[PDB]
A paper describes a structure:
The replication of RNA viruses relies on the activity of RNA-dependent RNA polymerases (RdRps). Despite large variations in their genomic sequences, viral RdRps share a common architecture generally known as a closed right hand. In most dsRNA viruses, RdRps perform both genome replication and transcription without the need for primers; during replication RdRps use positive-sense single-stranded RNA - (+)ssRNA - transcripts to produced dsRNA, whereas during transcription the produced negative-sense RNA - (-)ssRNA - serves as a template to produce (+)ssRNA copies from the dsRNA template. Although cystoviral P2 RdRps catalyse the same reactions, they have distinct template specificities.
The full-length φ8 P2 structure (residues 2-636) was determined at 3Å resolution by molecular replacement using an AF2 generated search model. The overall structure of φ8 P2 is roughly globular, consisting of 24 α-helices and 19 β-strands. It has a typical RNA polymerase fold and resembles a cupped right hand with finger, thumb and palm subdomains, which together form the active site of the enzyme. Despite the low sequence identity, the overall fold of φ8 P2 is similar to that of φ6 P2 (Root mean square deviation (RMSD) of the Cα atoms over 540 residues: 2.1Å) and φ12 P2 (RMSD of the Cα atoms over 534 residues: 2.1Å) and displays all the conserved structural features of RdRps. The main difference between φ8 P2 and the other two P2 structures appears to be in the first 50 residues at the N-terminus. Within the thumb subdomain, a notable variation is observed where a compact loop consisting of four residues in φ6 and φ12 P2, is substituted with an elongated β-hairpin structure spanning eleven residues (β2-β3) in φ8 P2. Because of the high concentration of CaCl2 in the crystallisation condition, a Ca2+ ion was modelled at the non-catalytic ion site of the φ8 P2 structure. The Ca2+ ion is coordinated by the sidechains of three aspartate residues (D323, D446, D475) as well as the main-chain carbonyl of lysine K479. In φ8 P2, the presence of Ca2+ ions could lock D323 into an inactive conformation, coordinating the non-catalytic site instead of the catalytic site, that hinders its ability to catalyse the reaction.
Numbering used by the authors: 2 to 636
Write the structure that this text describes.
């Protein structure tokens, strides 16, 4: 009972079907029918719909006479986008000085600006269960030791912390509501079950979850759109299991509106783990995250752009590396090694955290026009690092630093005689106590630091040769979203935000302006304008933008969004965000992208006034402390 047809009665590929049949069914017929009825009661349209295209409002023009919404598929907006993209081709990636790019702070041209804001590629590359978690090369014993020690350091101390859940997100199953009031009542009821709920999920007994809440905890694969360079080919798998070599990026005539030269959006696959399964794990994970990012903030955290540059000049030489398929090559052997290394949690907590990583998947269609869906009753499979797991940002920070700390063990700078001493020399490296080596890591983004340039080249040569992970030099020289700029070889190095990203998140956005995910779109575009005024490439790029903005809309960049601020405040029931002068940069970046707290800043770094308006639910530290004990996780 592993494969469950749901909508179009799809037929998987043989290599996939014969493998799924050999896998034992995750749920018995009692819980399966109870769950199938729940994924049909809810997700009615989402399960029976075809991909088609997107309905996104990209620009809202406020005039004395009227207000016009320009969508991504509007013909007048596509002619503006085509002309602005052509007018921005005069810019090219600038030269890189010893310690950063110079001249115009451009790490890439405005090429992605040809991406059609409403059309995504077909087929949207979908995950494949039997080919996930592949490491390729063997995992060394010294690396698995460093990975266990890095995880032990990260989850060494637990201090109950405030857990906020996005009010724009669903709860999945069993309970399915965006309501903030229902989300907390649903968690209080889960506390009353406590060990009975945790033991059922830790044993793969999804019948208990269906007895009291009507369904079983499943993970829903969601979509996250992205812009793409022209001529980029995407290879992957089909939602039936077939293999796609070159995902079609062409724009159909109904959507191109005659505007040639455009290509389609890349649609990445995300995961939406059940709120019932993720939240109890989040109540413990959040308690250790705010400690790890504070004790060892020299590696995994930051307070402002001036902390990165200061750590750079403390050692002298740096490089920038990105991990190729970091979440895809996340083997299950590495996950359990990190889970088993966590001190303070019971064996019930370890088995509970494993089941959250690999919940049964409800696969939906990606082929354009083909409406179909099925439920993979899979409990024991290598899932990689699903983006919905509460510990995705923390396991990424652990594995990334453990792979570079293993490179120093191969290099010989870190020689180990015991676990207790290796844990100590790792703590010193993380706190940047070593005078010769350090690093700044944020998952798949790592900047190794060294006092001698030849020491850094040897260290980077080692991690590139690793076969269990692909580390490649970042050609863009961006860390997080920070461009490293150096005016002249004599001037100091300054960090700037990429100006290409400003126009990306303004004219080719993922979600509509003033929508549920972007309630402060006008004010958010104003902050990007004022922030990037000091950017070296601000005068040249905005002279081009304002020229094309006036030619098609009769309003400049700042005029367009300052006038829309009056419309924004009215649409949000007079709710006025506090002026950015009183907010920190963490709150600033959280206003632009609400999904910043999940990858960059902490929940305690956001101002409480702004944090309450976006995140309605909030589990207090005393409620999390009661939960982690009631569920039976803490020893
Ligand atoms: Ca980078």
């Amino acid at each position: 009972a592993s494969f469950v047809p749901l909508v179009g009665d799809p037929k998987l590929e043989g290599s996939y079907f014969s493998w799924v049949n050999n896998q034992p069914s995750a749920m018995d017929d009692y819980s399966l029918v109870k769950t199938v009825a729940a994924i049909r009661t809810a997700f009615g349209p989402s399960i029976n719909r075809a991909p088609s295209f997107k309905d996104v409002t990209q620009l809202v023009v406020v005039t004395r006479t009227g207000v016009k919404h320009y969508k991504a598929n509007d013909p007048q907006y596509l002619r503006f986008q085509k002309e602005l993209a052509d007018a921005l081709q005069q810019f090219e990636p600038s030269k890189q000085l010893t310690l950063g790019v110079t001249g115009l702070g451009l790490t890439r041209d405005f090429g992605t600006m040809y991406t059609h804001g409403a059309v995504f590629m077909n087929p949207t590359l979908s995950p494949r269960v039997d080919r996930l978690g592949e490491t390729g090369g063997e995992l060394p014993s010294d690396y698995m030791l460093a990975l266990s020690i890095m995880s032990e350091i990260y989850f060494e101390e637990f201090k109950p912390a405030k857990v906020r859940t996005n009010g724009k997100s669903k709860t999945g199953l069993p309970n399915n509501t965006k309501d903030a009031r229902e989300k907390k009542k649903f968690f209080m009821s889960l506390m009353d079950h406590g060990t009975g709920w945790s033991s059922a999920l830790a044993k793969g007994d999804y019948s208990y979850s269906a007895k009291y809440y009507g369904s079983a905890p499943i993970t829903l694969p969601t979509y996250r759109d992205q812009l793409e360079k022209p001529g980029k080919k995407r290879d992957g798998y089909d939602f039936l299991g077939n293999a796609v070599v070159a995902a079609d990026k062409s724009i159909p005539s109904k959507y191109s509106q005659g505007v040639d030269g455009l290509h389609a959006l890349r649609r990445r696959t995300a995961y939406a783990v059940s709120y019932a399964a993720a939240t109890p794990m989040q109540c413990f994970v959040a308690g250790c995250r705010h400690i790890a990012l504070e004790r060892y903030g020299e590696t995994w955290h930051e307070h402002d752009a001036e902390d990165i540059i200061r750590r750079i000049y403390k050692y002298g030489f740096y490089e920038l590396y990105d991990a190729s398929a970091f979440d895809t090559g996340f083997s299950w052997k590495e996950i359990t090694t990190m889970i088993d290394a966590i001190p303070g949690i019971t064996d019930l907590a370890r088995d509970y955290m494993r089941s959250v990583h690999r919940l049964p998947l409800l696969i939906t269609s990606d082929v354009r026009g083909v409406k179909g869906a099925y439920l993979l009753n899979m409990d024991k499979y290598s899932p990689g690092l699903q983006s919905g797991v509460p510990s995705v940002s923390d396991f990424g920070k652990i594995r990334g630093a453990a792979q570079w700390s293993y490179g120093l063990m191969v290099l010989g700078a870190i020689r180990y005689q015991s676990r207790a001493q290796l844990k100590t020399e790792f703590k010193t490296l993380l706190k940047h106590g070593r005078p010769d080596f350090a690093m700044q890591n944020r998952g798949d983004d790592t900047m190794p630091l060294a006092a001698r340039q030849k020491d850094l080249q040897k260290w980077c040569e080692i991690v590139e040769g690793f076969k269990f992970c692909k580390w490649e030099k970042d050609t863009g020289k961006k860390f997080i979203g920070r461009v490293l700029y150096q005016r002249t070889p004599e001037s100091k190095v300054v960090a700037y935000s990429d100006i290409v990203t400003m126009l990306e998140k303004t004219f080719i956005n993922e979600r509509s302006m003033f929508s549920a995910h972007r309630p402060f779109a006008a004010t958010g575009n104003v902050m990007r304008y004022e922030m990037n005024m000091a950017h070296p490439a601000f005068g040249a790029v905005m002279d081009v933008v304002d020229t094309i903005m006036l030619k098609h809309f009769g309003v400049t960049y700042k005029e367009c969004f300052v006038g829309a601020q009056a419309l924004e405040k009215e649409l949000n029931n007079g709710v006025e965000l506090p002026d950015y002068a009183g907010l920190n940069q963490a709150t600033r970046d959280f206003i632009l992208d609400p999904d910043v707290i999940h990858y960059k800043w902490r929940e305690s770094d956001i101002d409480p006034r702004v944090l309450d308006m976006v995140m309605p639910t909030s589990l207090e530290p005393d409620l999390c402390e009661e939960a982690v004990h009631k569920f039976g996780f803490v020893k």
